[PDB]
Amino acid sequence: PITGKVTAVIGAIVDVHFEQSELPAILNALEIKTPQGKLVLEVAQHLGENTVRTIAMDGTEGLVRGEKVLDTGGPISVPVGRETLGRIINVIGEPIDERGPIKSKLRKPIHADPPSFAEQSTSAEILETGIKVVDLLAPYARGGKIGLFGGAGVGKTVFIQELINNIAKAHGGFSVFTGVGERTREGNDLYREMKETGVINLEGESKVALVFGQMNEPPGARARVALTGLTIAEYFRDEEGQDVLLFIDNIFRFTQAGSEVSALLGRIPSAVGYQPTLATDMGLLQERITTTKKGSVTSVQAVYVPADDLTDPAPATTFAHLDATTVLSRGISELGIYPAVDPLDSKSRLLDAAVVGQEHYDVASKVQETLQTYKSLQDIIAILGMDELSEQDKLTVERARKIQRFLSQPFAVAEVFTGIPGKLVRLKDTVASFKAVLEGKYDNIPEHAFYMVGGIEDVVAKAEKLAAE
Amino acid sequence: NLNETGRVLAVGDGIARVFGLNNIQAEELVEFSSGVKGMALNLEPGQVGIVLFGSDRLVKEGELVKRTGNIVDVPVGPGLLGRVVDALGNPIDGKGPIDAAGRSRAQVKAPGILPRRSVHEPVQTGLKAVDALVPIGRGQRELIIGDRQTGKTAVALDTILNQKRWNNGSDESKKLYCVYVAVGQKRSTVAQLVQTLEQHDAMKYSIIVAATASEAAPLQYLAPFTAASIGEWFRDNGKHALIVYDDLSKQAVAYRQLSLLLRRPPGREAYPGDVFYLHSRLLERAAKLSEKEGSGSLTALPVIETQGGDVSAYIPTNVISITDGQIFLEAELFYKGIRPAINVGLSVSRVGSAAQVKALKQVAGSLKLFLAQYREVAAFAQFGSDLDASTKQTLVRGERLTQLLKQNQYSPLATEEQVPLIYAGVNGHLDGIELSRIGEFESSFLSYLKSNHNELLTEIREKGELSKELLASLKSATESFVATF
Amino acid sequence: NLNETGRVLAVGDGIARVFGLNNIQAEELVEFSSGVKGMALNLEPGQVGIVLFGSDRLVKEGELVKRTGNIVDVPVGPGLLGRVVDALGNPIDGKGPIDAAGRSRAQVKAPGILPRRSVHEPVQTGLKAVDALVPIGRGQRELIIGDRQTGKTAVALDTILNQKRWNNGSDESKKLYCVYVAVGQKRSTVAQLVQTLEQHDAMKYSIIVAATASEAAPLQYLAPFTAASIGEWFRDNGKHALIVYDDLSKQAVAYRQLSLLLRRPPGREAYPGDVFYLHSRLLERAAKLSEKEGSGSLTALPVIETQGGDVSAYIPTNVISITDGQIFLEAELFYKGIRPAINVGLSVSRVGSAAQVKALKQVAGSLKLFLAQYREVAAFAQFGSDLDASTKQTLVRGERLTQLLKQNQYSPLATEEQVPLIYAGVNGHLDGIELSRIGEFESSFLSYLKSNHNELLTEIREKGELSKELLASLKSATESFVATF
Ligand SMILES: CCC[C@H](O)[C@@H](C)C(=O)NC/C=C\C[C@@H](C)[C@@H](O)[C@H](C)[C@@H]1C/C=C\C[C@H](C)[C@H](O)Cc2cc(OC)cc(O)c2C(=O)O1
Ligand SMILES: CCC[C@H](O)[C@@H](C)C(=O)NC/C=C\C[C@@H](C)[C@@H](O)[C@H](C)[C@@H]1C/C=C\C[C@H](C)[C@H](O)Cc2cc(OC)cc(O)c2C(=O)O1
Ligand SMILES: Nc1ncnc2c1ncn2[C@@H]1O[C@H](COP(=O)(O)OP(=O)(O)OP(=O)(O)O)[C@@H](O)[C@H]1O
Ligand SMILES: Nc1ncnc2c1ncn2[C@@H]1O[C@H](COP(=O)(O)OP(=O)(O)OP(=O)(O)O)[C@@H](O)[C@H]1O
Ligand SMILES: Nc1ncnc2c1ncn2[C@@H]1O[C@H](COP(=O)(O)OP(=O)(O)OP(=O)(O)O)[C@@H](O)[C@H]1O
Ligand SMILES: [Mg+2]
Ligand SMILES: [Mg+2]
Ligand SMILES: [Mg+2]
């Protein structure tokens, strides 16, 4: 075998001198043997003098200069196919449940080129989420990319879990969940909820594969784990021909991990200290997620937004790639409007009268124009109060307040925080409800009746309860 | 022989250092034993610096590298029509190999002050707003600028689709051949655009150059220059070409990345200081040649993404300072359903007014200014103040004209059909028609003119100009129809 | 012999460069001939870069350096209880040497997805507002986040003080050993805090780790990790520990200093990019283990200062994105004398609601939502004329409950005592009491309830839950007291 000595160690970065005519190629995986298990290094550069530079998939503590590394002869390769379902995998394809080897027939490199120009396909199927603000104003595309943008704590993980409950067991094919740099607690709670709901059966068939590299992991692992999850999803799409839905909790943690290793590599940073290749890094990850003629891949991607700064290079890079984007605003959540979706910044490719139908497009456009009018007034209203407005403005603002209050919804996964049981609202019921609100038919109802209810029949029931009380 | 070959000393981040290649030219193309191609940017006393067009992953230390002898160049000619190519002119549509009239360098110096000519003949887009208000001539560089999803590509694609009217005729002085460049677009998006151009039979006269976001930053930087060299082959032979760059901003991002990997310090907005020179030397290649130079033309339509409509941002204002004008596409108009959403105030064509179709200039007249006046009046009238006298009248006509300018995607109008529409709108015949019926007016009126007054439309088409008798006949037709409508 | 020893080549900015130490491990600990210690941070083919746990004055070029032979580690065990130590676990109280069960690495990987369990048993703080509104489970991470002087340390100290009602019992599963980490605090402040704990006898079960404002930034960075390693001994041996990181903002500042002196590229707010990795690999170590892992747990309370109350700043949003909720202390409330100043709207416990005492869960009900509604009603009603009956009752009930949640420092209540108070507030029996007499009610009611109805209090404590009979008898007790009161 090709073996090499460690010659430098700098955090996650390890330099290996191979002392022979043949070096490992870039992206090859090398192994070091360790007092517990093994350390995996992925080659990143050739420095010259038979020295390669490599990124470490686990902690480098205890490495010694002169320690012996062996080239495995290929990239990081992960088990793939139906034997991965119901099981939990780390960034290097090992099981991190207790259930023994994964014992799949195939193992496949986590680095691959996107589908060819001839393999592309594209849909305009609306994915009904049951979430009023999404189903009305930013309907998700089945087989498309969805991104959820929000700062810390604004609700995007609760949103993903509501989507998992509503969509994932209704979806006909397999699912893959990748947790990138989020809480190990959230992963354990997800695994328990998957077993309790039955999407995982330890003694039966399972519909979901789980891949985790959480925020306790080194930057190399948090960088590469998304590629393992995506390689499993791509195997289901191409080899099985299945329709997949791929969830990625906090794809920003992949990008940030790219910055961290880049800082150790010693590249000159872009923007606020991000790596160069940020855009091509994102392109190489995000282009593999497409649907193809072989099979559909839906994906829902949460995107943390640092300091809530949507101008941050990583959000701004991600916005270019997504078919639907949902923006969750801290201010809206502080008003108690959950699920905190900003109705105006959230947008979708599918909000097209040729796709949603003319009635839905009309209702959505009139809602958007009403809320944009209210936003335009809000600083005049803040200084002078509502009394300075015109009667047309007073009516438009009262209806805009009712509408934005009505976009709130009790999620079933978050009733612990709201007391109100969860509601699903059908798309047709949503569009009829908001059109009837736009007609002014309910302008006599108090705003509180609109808050946190599951459609207009519930608004009438709540208004009756308030009037009786 | 280290004169004609070299050895890779180091490679990473898509940059390789090579020993030898002593005879290599600056900006030459080299091929690696692993088969990737690369461009020699830096020549240094003991080493060359190569930027890699493919992935580095195939390259290894000690790889043999050999020099092509050619400055980075692409195949050019008529055999690229109907083909989709990468930034290096390799076919990616999966059809057979390309047949080329020759090769042309990617970086070539634009034609100077003497060989150029004034812009004097139209790029007929078939968009009522463009052809009437911001006319584009052959050899113009009209910028398209706006927020994402505001219709920029729809404007460019409808322009390309309109050329099907002339590109089937014999008169190759009228035929306009099209090039479209995808930079940093998804493979999905460009494949769907190809499928659309196939549906409209537009591919048979179109060429598409694609460097998607999957592609290395050197390819995304290079793709506009090689697309320009393809359009220049048509220009230099004496034919007319149009070139669309569906995002120059994504090229500027790719060049910022490449500059950082070359360890060149960033300048304003962290873009490299010569990010202007990157776009300017590109866009100066769009030109109209003199008769001595064979009368050919290349027309450019660069696309820019504004952030929040901020045209003051560095890259927007850089490109505005190059492009002989701009079409500005407004999110407020687009989401209000006024599509193509061209803001008539901020859009201006600095040279295409000399190249507008004369009949359309005659009927349009002040319309470009009148719509801006209407927009100011409407911005005051929305306050609900008293609208007496001309304010009421200007609100009525300005609304109907605005309703007359919106247009369906992939339905470009012939100029003979815009001329009667703009005539009927400008002369106020639509003041009697309610605003919900103006689209019906367009559909039935062109049906009436094309049924009963085809003589007028043929004379408008063939002459491009209204006589006083022809204008009087168009008046009588419009008055009769509005009397019946 | 350069294998086990080396020579300092250079010294500056807290970094010493050393020749030799060929066999040194990455992050091994070394001792300089002056007796200062350093961690070997990065290894190079020629040299080692070492971070000094001390002043640069203590190290000179040409001095000898020795391997200690082990990764940076700290003593751990019950023999640290009652002791104050530096970041390396040397005793600084001067009470003598430390007694240790062993040594544990400072950096060690948090327990994975499978060894964990959901939190299901409370960290009873004895703060009415916390135990009622934002309950903390054992194994939770709960951020305490505040402006300067808003009460953060008082909240943590009262939590530590409350434990002595169980840490003196026999039931080792109810005990909760405490660790407190002082980072960039003044030595005098730490000494006064230790005196405060020791005069309340809270020291016999508490450990304090100090890296004060003068102590080199590498020690301030290291101190939370070694305090975590001390708490992990309890977590891993089936005991329960609570760790307070009394400012993680000051650890982030020390890590920014260390990274910039290493010439690491500054990122947002000039913090290094991996400052999130600094805090998350710390806070992931607080966990509740399964019964296979011995059921132990480590609970963490990090503390953060927000300049100007900006919870949107970089480090606040980072730690909010790591922890399982936050207690937000509002300066406006603290200066209005509402102390402990818990903002009920912006604080939330994202996992500890399952760990709340069921009796408190029963009697609090929607109290958090009611208080959040009350604040917004009172916001307009401060000026709004002609208040309805609904708003009037909202103001009455919310003012009663706001006065009821006020609590004196160092006065944590038992849950047997919190339950009757929260019951009386939520059911509105206070609505007739004068707003200033509620403190009189609180102390006098409990004194009545202790003297007359002790059976109910002992039953609440022993069972932790209210049957319908116990709710009926607590209602009788409350109504008879208010009838007298
Ligand atoms: C430092 C970072 C801050 C960050 O910005 C913030 C998002 C964060 O980090 N954590 C807080 C997250 C959840 C806590 C909530 C579940 C809930 O406890 C509180 C009281 C909220 C407070 C908001 C409005 C009050 C209003 C009367 C409402 O209308 C009250 C209300 C009523 C309701 O009816 C059942 C349902 C609701 O969810 C709410 C509601 O949202 O209130
Ligand atoms: C992407 C950003 C672009 C950038 O923001 C912009 C500055 C830029 O870069 N280029 C725009 C360049 C030329 C366009 C003008 C020549 C002209 O075409 C229009 C209609 C202007 C519009 C302004 C006001 C309307 C008002 C009724 C006026 O008063 C109308 C008017 C009346 C008049 O009387 C005969 C003479 C006039 O010149 C005007 C006039 O200037 O209007
Ligand atoms: N005149 C029009 N009528 C109706 N729909 C239109 C019109 N012009 C554009 N659209 C639609 O608007 C949406 C966005 O426009 P377009 O496809 O041209 O994208 P774009 O502005 O180039 O944006 P991007 O930055 O995503 O490339 C698409 O659905 C397109 O179909
Ligand atoms: N419940 C309370 N009742 C009365 N006074 C209190 C209460 N809690 C805190 N205080 C007082 O308010 C001030 C806050 O002290 P504390 O140690 O909690 O500060 P801190 O918020 O940690 O801030 P800093 O670390 O910046 O000094 C001190 O005077 C403390 O005595
Ligand atoms: N739809 C909702 N209904 C009720 N409560 C909600 C809803 N969305 C969010 N919340 C509340 O807001 C917080 C959301 O936490 P969550 O874990 O979903 O946030 P996040 O955006 O994933 O944060 P992080 O950056 O920490 O990963 C919790 O307090 C939850 O109670
Ligand atoms: Mg989350
Ligand atoms: Mg486009
Ligand atoms: Mg303090």
Q: How far apart are CA B337 and CA A277, in angstroms?
A: 38
Two structure tokens written together for B99: 């047949």
Q: How far apart are CA C343 and CA A419, in angstroms?
A: 20
Q: Tokens 């509180």: give the residue.
A: A448
3-state helix/strand/coil string of A373-395 = HHHHHHHHHHHHCHHHCCHHHHH
- Are residue A107 and residue A209 in the same domain, yes or no? yes
Distance C465 CA to ligand 6 centre (A): 33
Distance C62 CA to ligand 3 centre (A): 70
Two structure tokens written together for B470: 């022809």
Q: How far apart are CA C75 and CA C227, in angstroms?
A: 10
Q: Tokens 């000094």: give the residue.
A: C52
Q: How far apart are CA B352 and CA A320, in angstroms?
A: 33
Residue A372 belongs to some domain of the structure: yes
Between helices B367-381 and B415-426, what is the axis angle to 10°?
Answer: 50
CATH number at residue A444: 1.10.1140.10
State whether the beta carbon of C149 lies less than 6 angstroms from ligand 4.
Answer: yes
Quote the number of domains for chain B.
3
Two structure tokens written together for B1: 């022989």
CATH number at residue A47: 2.40.10.170
Q: How far apart are CA C208 and CA C84, in angstroms?
A: 5
Residue B100's domain comprises: 75-360
Give the CA angle between residues C242, C243, C247 to the nearest 5°: 145
Residues C360 and C464 sit within 8 Å (Cβ to Cβ): no
CA separation, residue B328 to residues A340, B140, B146, B243 (Å): 33, 16, 6, 18
CB atoms within 10 A of CB B292: 9
- Are residue A341 and residue A416 in the same domain, yes or no? no
CB atoms within 10 A of CB C449: 21
Helix (H) or strand (E) holding A358: helix A358-384
Q: How far apart are CA B51 and CA B29, in angstroms?
A: 10
Q: How far apart are CA B147 and CA B170, in angstroms?
A: 39
Catalytic-role residue among B7, B350, B437, B461: B350
Q: How far apart are CA B185 and CA A373, in angstroms?
A: 34
Give the CA angle between residues C166, C168, C171 to the nearest 5°: 60
Residues A455 and A436 sit within 8 Å (Cβ to Cβ): no
Of A30, A46, A78, which residue is a domain's last? A78
- The beta-strand segments (E) located in C125-263 are 143-146, 177-183, 206-211, 240-245
Residues C185 and C247 sit within 8 Å (Cβ to Cβ): yes
CA atoms within 13 A on the CB side of B341: 24
DSSP code for A238? I
- Are residue A51 and residue A161 in the same domain, yes or no? no
Which residues 6+ apart lie within 8 Å of B405 measured at CB? B128, B129, B132, B338, B342
- Are residue A256 and residue A219 in the same domain, yes or no? yes
Q: How far apart are CA A27 and CA B90, in angstroms?
A: 26
The number of the ligand nearest the C-alpha atom of A328 reads: 5
Catalytic-role residue among A182, A186, A234, A260: A182
Beginning with the edge strand found earlier in the chain, give each strand of the sheet holding A208-213 in spatial order.
Answer: A88-89, A208-213, A175-180, A244-249, A297-304, A145-150, A324-327, A347-348
Q: Tokens 């200069």: give the residue.
A: A65
Give the CA angle between residues B230, B234, B239 to the nearest 5°: 160
- Are residue B323 and residue B456 in the same domain, yes or no? no
CB atoms within 10 A of CB C105: 18
Q: How far apart are CA C159 and CA C477, in angstroms?
A: 29
Q: Tokens 């815009």: give the residue.
A: B418
Residue C204 backbone phi and psi in degrees, to 5: -60, -20
Helix (H) or strand (E) holding B222: helix B217-237
Secondary structure percentages of chain C, helix, strand, coil, to 5: 45, 20, 35
Residue type, A109: P
- Are residue C123 and residue C233 in the same domain, yes or no? yes
Of A49, A78, A107, which residue is a domain's last? A78
State whether the beta carbon of B149 lies less than 6 angstroms from ligand 3.
Answer: yes
Three-state SS at B24 = coil
Q: How far apart are CA B185 and CA B189, in angstroms?
A: 6
For chain A, the C-alpha Rg in angstroms (whole number) is 25
Please choose, from the candidates A2, A14, A16, the residue with its C-alpha nearest in 3D space to the C-alpha of residue A62. Answer: A14
Q: How far apart are CA B267 and CA B275, in angstroms?
A: 9
Sign of the C-alpha dihedral computed for residues B285, B289, B293 and B294 taken in this order: positive
Q: How far apart are CA A255 and CA B184, in angstroms?
A: 18
Residue type, A108: K
CB atoms within 10 A of CB C162: 24
Task: Give the residue, by CA position, lying nearest to ligand 5 atom 26.
Answer: C321
The chains found to touch A (3+ Cβ pairs under 8 angstroms) are: B, C
Which residues 6+ apart lie within 8 Å of A321 measured at CB? A145, A147, A282, A283, A286, A287, B186, B213
Helix (H) or strand (E) holding A19: none
- Are residue A72 and residue A87 in the same domain, yes or no? no
State whether the beta carbon of C126 lies less than 6 angstroms from ligand 4.
Answer: no
- Are residue B373 and residue B445 in the same domain, yes or no? yes
Query: Hey, are the CB atoms on C353 and A416 less than 8 Å from each other?
Result: yes
DSSP-assigned beta bridge partners for residue B64: B7
Q: Tokens 């407020």: give the residue.
A: B332
Considering only CB atoms, which chain B residues are within 8 Å of A277?
A: 13, 217, 257, 261
DSSP-assigned beta bridge partners for residue A41: A30, A56
Burial class (CB in 10 A: 0-12, 13-18, 19+), B462: exposed
Residues A214 and A247 sit within 8 Å (Cβ to Cβ): no
Strands A38-48 and A51-56: antiparallel
Biggest alpha carbon–alpha carbon distance for chain B:
88
Residue A421's domain comprises: 358-468
Query: Hey, are the CB atoms on C23 and A7 less than 8 Å from each other?
Result: no
Task: Give the residue, by CA position, lying nearest to ligand 1 atom 24.
Answer: A336
Burial class (CB in 10 A: 0-12, 13-18, 19+), A218: buried
- Are residue B13 and residue B107 in the same domain, yes or no? no
Two structure tokens written together for A108: 């496949």
State whether the beta carbon of C150 lies less than 6 angstroms from ligand 4.
Answer: yes
- Are residue C251 and residue C354 in the same domain, yes or no? yes
Residues C304 and C328 sit within 8 Å (Cβ to Cβ): no
CA separation, residue B305 to residues B146, B214, B329, B352, B432 (Å): 5, 20, 10, 23, 40
Q: Tokens 């290929």: give the residue.
A: A74
Closest in A15, A191, A219 to C113, CB measured: A191
CB atoms within 10 A of CB B191: 27
Distance B149 CA to ligand 3 centre (A): 5
Cis peptide before C340 (omega within 30 of 0): yes
- Are residue A154 and residue A281 in the same domain, yes or no? yes
DSSP-assigned beta bridge partners for residue A348: A324
- Are residue A269 and residue A139 in the same domain, yes or no? yes
Between helices B438-452 and B390-405, what is the axis angle to 10°?
Answer: 70
Q: How far apart are CA A427 and CA A133, in angstroms?
A: 10
Two structure tokens written together for B156: 């460019």
Closest in C71, C118, C312 to A61, CB measured: C71
| Ligand 3 atom, smallest distance to B303 CA | 22
Task: Give the residue, by CA position, lying nearest to ligand 5 atom 23.
Answer: A153
Q: How far apart are CA C295 and CA C311, in angstroms?
A: 34
Residue A211 belongs to some domain of the structure: yes
Considering only CB atoms, which chain A residues are within 8 Å of C326?
A: 153
DSSP code for B438? H
- Are residue A258 and residue A114 in the same domain, yes or no? yes
Q: How far apart are CA C229 and CA B41, in angstroms?
A: 53
3-state helix/strand/coil string of C423-470 = HHHHCCHHHHCCHHHHHHHHHHHHHHHHHHCHHHHHHHHHHCCCCHHH
- Are residue A260 and residue A406 in the same domain, yes or no? no
For chain B, the C-alpha Rg in angstroms (whole number) is 25
Resolution (A): 2.9
- Are residue B242 and residue B387 in the same domain, yes or no? no
- Are residue A145 and residue A55 in the same domain, yes or no? no
Please choose, from the candidates A405, A337, A368, the residue with its C-alpha nearest in 3D space to the C-alpha of residue A154. Answer: A337
Please choose, from the candidates B206, B212, B178, B164, the residue with its C-alpha nearest in 3D space to the C-alpha of residue B300. Answer: B178
Of C316, C343, C361, which residue is a domain's last? C361
Three-state SS at B103 = strand
State whether the beta carbon of A153 lies less than 6 angstroms from ligand 1.
Answer: yes
Residues B218 and B284 sit within 8 Å (Cβ to Cβ): no
Residue type, C402: T
Considering only CB atoms, which chain C residues are within 8 Å of A151?
A: 312, 317
CB atoms within 10 A of CB C72: 25
CATH number at residue A240: 3.40.50.300
- The beta-strand segments (E) located in C246-334 are 297-305, 325-329
Q: How far apart are CA C5 and CA C48, in angstroms?
A: 11
- Are residue A335 and residue A385 in the same domain, yes or no? no
- Nearest chain A residue (CA) to B270: A271
* Closest chain A C-alpha to B338 CA, distance in angstroms: 12
Quote the number of domains for chain A.
3
Q: Tokens 């960039």: give the residue.
A: C184
Please choose, from the candidates B110, B99, B108, the residue with its C-alpha nearest in 3D space to the C-alpha of residue B75. Answer: B99
Residue A190 belongs to some domain of the structure: yes
- Are residue B341 and residue B433 in the same domain, yes or no? no
CATH number at residue C287: 3.40.50.300
- Are residue B291 and residue B201 in the same domain, yes or no? yes
Sign of the C-alpha dihedral computed for residues C207, C211, C212 and C213 taken in this order: negative
- Are residue A156 and residue A217 in the same domain, yes or no? yes
Q: Could you write out the DSSP letters of every residue in B323-391?
A: SSEEEEE-HHHHHTT-SS-B-TTT-EESSGGGTS-HHHHHHHTTHHHHHHHHHHHHHHHTT----TTHH
Residue type, C219: L
Query: Hey, are the CB atoms on C348 and A417 less than 8 Å from each other?
Result: yes
Two structure tokens written together for C183: 């980072």
Two structure tokens written together for B344: 């008539």
Residue A460 belongs to some domain of the structure: yes
Residues A120 and B194 sit within 8 Å (Cβ to Cβ): no
Q: Which residues of C are catalytic?
A: 350
Please choose, from the candidates C123, C51, C33, the residue with its C-alpha nearest in 3D space to the C-alpha of residue C87. Answer: C51
Q: Tokens 């049951």: give the residue.
A: A130
Of B360, B382, B415, which residue is a domain's last? B360
Query: Hey, are the CB atoms on A216 and C42 less than 8 Å from each other?
Result: no
Q: How far apart are CA C333 and CA C352, in angstroms?
A: 24
Helix (H) or strand (E) holding A45: strand A38-48
- Are residue C418 and residue C286 in the same domain, yes or no? no
- Are residue B111 and residue B40 in the same domain, yes or no? no
CA separation, residue B422 to residues A7, A206, B236 (Å): 77, 64, 36
Q: How was this structure determined?
A: cryo-EM
Residue A353 belongs to some domain of the structure: no
Of A320, A348, A376, which residue is a domain's last? A348
Of B30, B58, B74, which residue is a domain's last? B74
Which residues 6+ apart lie within 8 Å of A444 measured at CB? none
- The beta-strand segments (E) located in B80-224 are 84-85, 102-105, 143-146, 176-183, 206-211
Give the CA angle between residues A362, A364, A365 to the nearest 5°: 65
The number of the ligand nearest the C-alpha atom of C335 reads: 4
Two structure tokens written together for B160: 């390309």
Q: How far apart are CA B254 and CA B278, in angstroms?
A: 11
CB of B96 less than 8 A from some CB of A: no
- Are residue B26 and residue B51 in the same domain, yes or no? yes
Two structure tokens written together for C317: 């949003």
CA separation, residue B29 to residues A247, A344, B67 (Å): 42, 49, 6
Q: Tokens 């500056």: give the residue.
A: C12
Three-state SS at A43 = strand
CATH number at residue B441: 1.20.150.20
Residues C140 and C301 sit within 8 Å (Cβ to Cβ): no
State whether the beta carbon of B348 lies less than 6 angstroms from ligand 2.
Answer: yes
- Are residue B91 and residue B217 in the same domain, yes or no? yes
Q: Is A183 a catalytic residue?
A: yes
Q: How far apart are CA C37 and CA A260, in angstroms?
A: 27
Helix (H) or strand (E) holding C63: none
* Closest chain C C-alpha to A455 CA, distance in angstroms: 22
Burial class (CB in 10 A: 0-12, 13-18, 19+), A29: buried
